[PDB]
Amino acid sequence: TTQRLGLIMNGVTGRMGLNQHLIRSIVAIRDQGGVRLKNGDRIMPDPILVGRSAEKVEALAKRFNIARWTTDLDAALADKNDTMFFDAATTQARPGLLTQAINAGKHVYCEKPIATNFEEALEVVKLANSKGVKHGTVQDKLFLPGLKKIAFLRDSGFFGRILSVRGEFGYWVFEGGWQEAQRPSWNYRDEDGGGIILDMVCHWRYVLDNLFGNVQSVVCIGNTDIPERFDEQGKKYKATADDSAYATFQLEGGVIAHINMSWVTRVYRDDLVTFQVDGTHGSAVAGLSDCMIQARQATPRPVWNPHDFYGDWQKLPDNVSYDNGFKEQWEMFIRHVYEDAPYKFTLLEGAKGVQLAECALKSWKERRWIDVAPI
Amino acid sequence: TTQRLGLIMNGVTGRMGLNQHLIRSIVAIRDQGGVRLKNGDRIMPDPILVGRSAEKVEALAKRFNIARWTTDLDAALADKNDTMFFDAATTQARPGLLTQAINAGKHVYCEKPIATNFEEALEVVKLANSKGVKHGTVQDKLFLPGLKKIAFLRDSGFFGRILSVRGEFGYWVFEGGWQEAQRPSWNYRDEDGGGIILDMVCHWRYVLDNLFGNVQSVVCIGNTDIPERFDEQGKKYKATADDSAYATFQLEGGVIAHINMSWVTRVYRDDLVTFQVDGTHGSAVAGLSDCMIQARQATPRPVWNPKRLHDFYGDWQKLPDNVSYDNGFKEQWEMFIRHVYEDAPYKFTLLEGAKGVQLAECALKSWKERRWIDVAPI
Amino acid sequence: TTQRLGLIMNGVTGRMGLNQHLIRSIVAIRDQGGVRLKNGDRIMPDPILVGRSAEKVEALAKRFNIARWTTDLDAALADKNDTMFFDAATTQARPGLLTQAINAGKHVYCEKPIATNFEEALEVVKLANSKGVKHGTVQDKLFLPGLKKIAFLRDSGFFGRILSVRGEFGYWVFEGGWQEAQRPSWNYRDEDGGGIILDMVCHWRYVLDNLFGNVQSVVCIGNTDIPERFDEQGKKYKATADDSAYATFQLEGGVIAHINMSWVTRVYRDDLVTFQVDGTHGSAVAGLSDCMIQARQATPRPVWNPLHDFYGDWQKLPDNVSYDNGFKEQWEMFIRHVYEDAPYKFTLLEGAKGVQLAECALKSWKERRWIDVAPIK
Known about the structure:
The structure is cut from a larger assembly and holds three copies of chain A.
Chain A: E1 2-10, H1 16-32, E2 42-50, H2 60-63, E3 68-70, H3 73-78, E4 84-87, H4 93-103, E5 107-110, H5 118-131, E6 135-137, H6 145-155, E7 162-170, H7 196-211, E8 215-223, E9 228-230, E10 236-238, E11 244-251, E12 256-262, E13 273-279, E14 282-286, E15 291-295, E16 314-315, H8 325-339, H9 347-366, E17 370-371
Parallel strand pairs in A: 1-2, 1-4, 2-3, 4-5, 5-6, 7-12
Antiparallel strand pairs in A: 7-13, 8-11, 8-17, 9-10, 11-12, 13-14, 14-15, 15-16
PDB class: oxidoreductase
Keywords: structural genomics, protein structure initiative, new york structural genomix research consortium, nysgxrc, oxidoreductase, PSI-2, New York SGX Research Center for Structural Genomics
Entry title: CRYSTAL STRUCTURE OF putative oxidoreductase from Bradyrhizobium japonicum USDA 110
């Protein structure tokens, strides 16, 4: 009729750990009355919070009326009444902590990426599999209504045979001189783990794999478009990270995909990300929220002469309510743990993202295509 | 390059034969320099006009400087220098006129319908086959850009599998009291061949057969909605024809089609006629010139609930104009003219006109006898 | 000033039962402090919710501040304290339960169809009459603002002589493969009572009779456009009911009515149902909520000729009253009928007429002909 689930949460109070997982997922599932099951009964999550410094992570507990928080990680790690672990903090610190929770015997859940390098990521998977714990990693973009729509177009046969994918990602992140940068500055320093390739190509791994087909090889060149940016404190620094990159992918089954990604581009399109899918029987252009289709019978017949082409397309109706994507995946992992509901998004998948990003960086460095060794 | 086509056209004095067949078809073709063939050659029609009264036929011959005319149809048929016959005059004298032209070895083209009854019509199709001449009848609706697009959709697999067809035909024809009727009054008199069933069901035969699958049966009820109407002279008369009719068709391949047709209905739709086609994978709604589509992926998900306004029309997309659309009467002419001169493939033979009469008569019968009526294969 | 009406409610839980009857009718009536009688009294409903599962009925009773609930319909029907019975569940069970309620001495109110069977419906009517209890069936389409407007157009002579009626009903009911069906799966199985003809032709009997004239005869043909669909549990099942249908009706006074109806059509019109009425002096096109009109004087003059906006030639009727929930309104009408002899057309006999036309329609399909609607002796 009603059960209890212990859940320790590291790195909450991001940025977006706070927003997406804390506010929009845990507190959300809390209020609604808990996670559904198979035979009607419900799972109530009992969180216990963990941050960095207790003078800023203080009120959150009763700010949403939960239970416990400590500054020392080992405190919540120890408990056996807490049977699960979540983390949304720093990249380098993550695998070490996953290990500690895996050792501690906790089911695991975390943000992207799971590690800095493939070796580290792969070993974490092996720890989790060996122990026999359940594991999961966030694959949020899949749950964007826009991409949810692409899937529906795929499943329902709209494209006929999918042919090509065009991805256009990003917006102009301000350099910090006249207007404050919208994104944290570590993202623009190579030595602090910054880099649009290892940041985004991590996502495109699962977007491509899941929507259109398994990635087999990539060619990618990055660049540092802007040499100097300004700190969160207004201090200039040498920007060493790739802030733009241009990748082409070959997918299993014959589909080719190209994604331009950049923090240094201005937006003349439907959204901050765009995916165009050209199929033999129609095409789609998806954004974060909406998705436009053009069946082949609606395709106009222009000719070269040295007309609103957008009007030739139609917007998909919203036929379901779209839940927050983070929450939906939180509910799927919980079903996996307590119900043996099948789960695609284990830490293996995180590892694939980091593998792909490394393939990309290697393709840059060696000026050639790079094949994605199966795991 | 320039060959000659000796064509005798009969009903070109009247309203459609003048405007559609002479003007917009033949005169247009002449002014183009003729009908282009696959081999590059052009077939030139040198027409000779008939139409009963001499003082009004040469004036008609003068407007488009046609050099040939008579009032003597029988000698016009005897003249073997002319090889093709066209009729746009009365339906009652048509089958006999067709019979005369066929016997005399003429190729034969004619307006709708081919005859006043199916038995007479079938005789002529057989006669024309017996002699080995090329024969054709007008099927204008099939050339509506709207229905052209329906065909495109069908051919390209848009519908997936076609399921149902809804036709909504007509508009309010003024009774004559305060406004001039749009339409000749013979249409509202049964005793003068008037009647919407045998006027329109004739069309529906081919629209249905060609877009959707062959008609196997028809249940139909007509009615006379307006008892009294006024002449082209403003003279009162009693309406005896049916001016409304509701018909349901069972089609080959398991499709059902229904068509409402009326001269006594006000228009709340895209056009003077409308065909909705529902398939597994998408639907379409076509009028005279335009066609809207809703692929199944774009179908919304409304739920029965008596608040916020929603625009259903907005879930549809207007098909683009990817081709030039020519006058449909002109196109079929050129089509028939190529069938005669270069063996071009041409479906629209008098056999098709007989099918039309077969259906109207079937519909009238189902009305008379309160039941479904199966369309016997010829 | 206050009087307590003990009412057992059976069919609630289902989407339409819960929303229209429980919430929007009874609970609303409760919340206004009961149905206001002619002298000044207010009749308070004290409901008892009935369902085959105790967990799903106790919660529902709770969240609407109710008090009473059970799974034992049989005990609820023999109470004697509760004076009226309402059913909105299965049509297969409806006459049986109706018959208990009647023989237990209770007043009866119910959703349609009242039975699966014309003869079965007729015995139920005859019985309730023998017992002198009050009885009614739901006839909701008539309470649609769209159709209330059409009635006003008739009553006030807008049409002159009505000549014909074109009805368009339906929308695409998702097959379940990639999108979830809007409607319960039973509707698509003949063996479980499904079929658009016997579902909607019931509504059409009262719609046409009241608005336009008595149905004298029908010709109708059904079909099953989609051979397979999916359960509420994602289970593939073989679809055996008619899901589309096309009926022409001859009505008294020389009026012909045609109605297309389908769960497999897409929507290119003003609403999920549309009624055009063509009359001598004007025409109207109604949806659920709105009604457009074109007086004869406003009729334009197109001629046939292979851009004009015909929709623009109509005028949208103003809303001159507030329209309440149609279900709520009939409930109040039934309650007044029960408690102060109010005029009430909407007895089970009307429901029986509804089942008769459905049967006439299916017969018409089966025997391929027009079927006259016999009088009820």
